[PDB]
Design a protein around this nucleic acid. Structure first.
Ligand SMILES: [Mg+2]
Ligand SMILES: [Mg+2]
Ligand SMILES: [Mg+2]
Ligand SMILES: [Mg+2]
Ligand SMILES: [Mg+2]
Ligand SMILES: [Mg+2]
Ligand SMILES: [Mg+2]
Ligand SMILES: [Mg+2]
Ligand SMILES: [Mg+2]
Ligand SMILES: [Mg+2]
Ligand SMILES: [Mg+2]
Ligand SMILES: [Mg+2]
Ligand SMILES: [Mg+2]
Ligand SMILES: [Mg+2]
Ligand SMILES: [Mg+2]
Ligand SMILES: [Mg+2]
Lengths: 402, 63, 107, 153
RNA sequence: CCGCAGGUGCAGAUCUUGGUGGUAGUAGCAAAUAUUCAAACGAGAACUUUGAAGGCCGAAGUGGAGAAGGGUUCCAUGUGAA
RNA sequence: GAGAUUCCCACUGUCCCUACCUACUAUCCAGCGAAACCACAGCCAAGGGAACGGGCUUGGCGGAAUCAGCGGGGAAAGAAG
């Protein structure tokens, strides 16, 4: 008989293989549709989730309760050191799909990039691409490479560049760089091949790929939660306290017929570490990173047009469980999948942004830099010292320093 | 080697519990050779077997 | 050399963090033994009874956060044994742990 | 005594046997299958590593409920364990076989385990007590073991 | 082979007795806070013994002695099959 | 009055709406090691059939060996209703 009262289903069947992701990076799975009218550009980038903070900004939304008002909004910092382009892949369209036609790798592949090709770098002889790079010098290999480029020009429909991240600029333990095929859009195949070939061995910063106050997609693997039950995994109703064999269960896992457990019944297993794609994350800021012209510059990270405070994006005492952010970063709006120092893919939006939520100018007034390792209450070291005055350890240091 | 008999006999001779019987951990063979209460008495006289003092339960706090 | 003796300080707090109450002191002994094995490369590690008493001084669950120990690598050449070297770990009483380095100590 | 699989030449070969050994037949069978065909030095160090939990024996036939380990990937398998008692019993049998090889006067740096066989022994009865005044068996599963080593290099 | 005579032919009877599998190296070895260090004996020590330490019973006891019941379990030495 | 019932104050995780922590397990390992049950076995839809099939017909299809869970089925087991 029918269930006595109607209730919506727990969880979505659109994510049913609720399993550990087979990948750690997070693959794009759909690049933006290519039109030759646009200029040649890259469609994606790789960053690392540094941490979260919040900002103060004035809203320019007419007809809203918060029009011309100040709001506090949570933001995520994604450290994005420049990618390095080391290869070009061509794809050809077939009645069976896109297939890889030819891959051409640049000379002088970086050490951290070459680490990706080895499971045990310590015991390796570091021989990868050593014979391949020799064909960039002799005339035979150069002719073969030119033939490969011409074949890509005359046969391939879409081309992509292999780009890797720069581990040495990150505060992480890992030295193995992350490789990625990033699609080149906006032009003829010849034009995008010329563009990619000029960008071989070069560094592409994040400001050449993404711009201010545009809405992008974030692709990544969520935080792992291990083996979880139905109550935590599918958020089913807890059974009453009087239940005998357990109350964190689904009471009925199916009727007598069809005499099997259906795939749509909530059951325990892996939770978290799932590949996910969240669209429409606005870029509130693109930080500039640390420079040394005559002295070290850190203002360009957290100083706004109304703050004018010489402070960087790093919170007081550093980002918890990440480290210190010294490269370019992207201040996105809201939360982003994954743990700290988890690698994320930033992709251009597949959609046309016409709503007034999008295309809205973002002007920050304040960026919070209090310590996240507790209830931080001071924005800067100088402010904390000015408030608290000299201390005992400062006194005993100055006594020795005379 | 195994001094259960010696500990029991020492407790009986010293008129204390087996808690308070102290056998010399270095003179294990000499104590193990003791199989009689006379030999236990001789070991007590020689100092290889000692009656440990009562654990202190002070009444200064109560006073 | 191989008959070297050094003075270390061990973060028992760090190595015991997360261990249940009835396991903290036994795990502190196990971590001290593992620390000695890692530092001196000797599977044969003896722990002085004074050091054991120092670790068990405050009961089974309130183990001291830091402890100053002395690792001495000594010849085991007294009988036919698989290992010819062993590490004796003794207890070094200190009043403070501030600014204490790992120091080579002479004979 | 009658061994199964008599050696092809009983002058380059030595034999070892044990009966009613108090080890589990299933674990011992898996360990014997693991060390079968090995050189004697390799088998000795492998059994020592099994005792030290640095190399596993793959549980292939008697694998019901046996957990997974990383060391099972050395073999083409997933389930492996470290039967200490089986390893020690096979080590004693290997020492006995090496002594027999010494007595027969053939050098023990070229011996290979060509034959090894584990058979069930007569079970020994013990008793366990269950919920409602019931008695259940608590049988042991001892095993006979035999091995034939042969010189080859 | 010719006759004679049967306690004369098994797949079953939740058959009788005996033996053996899969289950399965699985369930399990989770009631009463707790063990650690060194040494000795020893082929072999998480469990034995000694010493040190940390704990528990807390005198209505996990202490000291009896009745009923048991019947040698008491004590010393030795062994390491079960 | 450890009797049956209704309401009120207080109280609260009974609930909204669940979350987190602790001990012992479960889990993995060394050692030890049962039992229940068992025609053969074990993926489905429909058909017909002792009128609700694991086997038959017609179709869908089918890839070694396994681990932790689970309670839809085996018209599961337990007892000649
Ligand atoms: Mg309805
Ligand atoms: Mg109930
Ligand atoms: Mg915080
Ligand atoms: Mg099983
Ligand atoms: Mg029982
Ligand atoms: Mg009974
Ligand atoms: Mg008859
Ligand atoms: Mg029959
Ligand atoms: Mg088990
Ligand atoms: Mg258990
Ligand atoms: Mg007490
Ligand atoms: Mg009494
Ligand atoms: Mg007795
Ligand atoms: Mg059917
Ligand atoms: Mg009937
Ligand atoms: Mg009846």
């Amino acid at each position: 008989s029918h269930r006595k009262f109607s209730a919506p289903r727990h969880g979505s069947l659109g994510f049913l293989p609720r399993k550990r992701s087979s990948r750690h990076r997070g693959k794009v799975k759909s690049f933006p549709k290519d039109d030759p009218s646009k200029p040649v550009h890259l469609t994606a980038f790789l960053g690392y989730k540094a941490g979260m903070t919040h900002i103060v900004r004035e809203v320019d939304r007419p007809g809203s309760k918060v029009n011309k008002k100040e709001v506090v909004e949570a933001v995520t910092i994604v450290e994005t050191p420049p990618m390095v382009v080391v290869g070009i892949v061509g794809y050809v369209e077939t009645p069976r799909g896109l297939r890889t036609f030819k891959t051409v790798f640049a000379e002088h592949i970086s050490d951290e990039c070459k680490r990706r090709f080895y499971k045990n770098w310590h015991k390796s002889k570091k021989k990868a691409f050593t014979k391949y790079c020799k064909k960039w010098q002799d005339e035979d290999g150069k002719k073969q490479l030119e033939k490969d480029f011409s074949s890509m020009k005359k046969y391939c429909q879409v081309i992509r560049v292999i780009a890797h991240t720069q581990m040495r600029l990150l505060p992480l333990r890992q030295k193995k760089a992350h490789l990625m095929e990033i699609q080149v859009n906006g032009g003829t195949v010849a034009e995008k091949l010329d563009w990619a070939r000029e960008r071989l061995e070069q560094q592409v910063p994040v400001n050449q790929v993404f711009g201010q106050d545009e809405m992008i997609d974030v692709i990544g693997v969520t935080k792992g939660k291990g083996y979880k039950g139905v109550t935590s995994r599918w958020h089913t109703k807890k059974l009453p306290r009087k239940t005998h064999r357990g109350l964190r269960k689904v009471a009925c896992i199916g009727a007598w017929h069809p005499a099997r457990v259906a795939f749509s019944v909530a059951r325990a297993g892996q939770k978290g570490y799932h590949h996910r794609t969240e669209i429409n994350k606005k870029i509130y800021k693109i930080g500039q990173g640390y420079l040394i012209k005559d002295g070290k510059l850190i203002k360009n990270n957290a100083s706004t047009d109304y703050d004018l405070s010489d402070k960087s994006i790093n919170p007081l005492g550093g980002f918890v469980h990440y480290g210190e952010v010294t490269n370019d970063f992207v201040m996105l709006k809201g939360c982003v999948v994954g743990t700290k120092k988890r690698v994320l893919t930033l992709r251009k939006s597949l959609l046309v942004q016409t709503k007034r939520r999008a295309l809205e100018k973002i002007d920050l007034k304040f960026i919070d830099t209090t310590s996240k390792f507790g209830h931080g209450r001071f924005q800067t070291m100088e402010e904390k010292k000015a408030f608290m005055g000299p201390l005992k350890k400062d006194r005993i240091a100055k006594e020795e320093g005379a | 080697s195994m001094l259960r008999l010696q500990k029991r006999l020492a407790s009986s001779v010293l008129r204390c519990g087996k808690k308070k019987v102290w056998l010399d951990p270095n003179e294990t063979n000499e104590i193990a050779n003791a199989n009689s209460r006379q030999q236990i008495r001789k070991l007590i006289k020689d100092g290889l077997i000692i009656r440990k003092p009562v654990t202190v339960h002070s009444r200064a706090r109560c006073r | 050399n191989e008959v070297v003796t050094r003075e270390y300080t061990i973060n028992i707090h760090k190595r015991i963090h997360g261990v249940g109450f009835k396991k903290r002191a036994p795990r502190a002994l196990k971590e001290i033994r593992k620390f000695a094995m890692k530092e001196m490369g000797t599977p044969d590690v003896r722990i002085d009874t004074r050091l054991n008493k120092a670790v068990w001084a405050k009961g089974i669950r309130n183990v001291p956060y830091r402890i100053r120990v002395r690792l001495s690598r000594k010849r085991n050449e007294d009988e036919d044994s698989p290992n010819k070297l062993y590490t004796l770990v003794t207890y070094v009483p200190v009043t403070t742990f501030k600014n204490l380095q790992t120091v080579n100590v002479d004979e | 005594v009658r061994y199964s699989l008599d050696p092809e030449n009983p002058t380059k070969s030595c034999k070892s046997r044990g009966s009613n050994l108090r080890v589990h037949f299933k674990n011992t069978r898996e360990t014997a299958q693991a060390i079968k065909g090995m050189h004697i030095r390799k088998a000795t160090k492998y059994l020592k590593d099994v005792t030290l939990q640095k190399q596993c024996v793959p549980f292939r036939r008697y694998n019901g409920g046996v957990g997974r380990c990383a060391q099972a990937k050395q073999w083409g398998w997933t389930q492996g364990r470290w039967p200490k008692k089986s390893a020690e019993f096979l080590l004693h049998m290997l020492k006995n076989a090496e002594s027999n090889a010494e007595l027969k006067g053939l050098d023990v740096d070229s011996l290979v385990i060509e034959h090894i066989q584990v058979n069930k022994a007569p079970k020994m009865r013990r008793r366990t007590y269950r919920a409602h005044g019931r008695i259940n068996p608590y049988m042991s599963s001892p095993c006979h073991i035999e091995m034939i080593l042969t010189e080859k290099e």
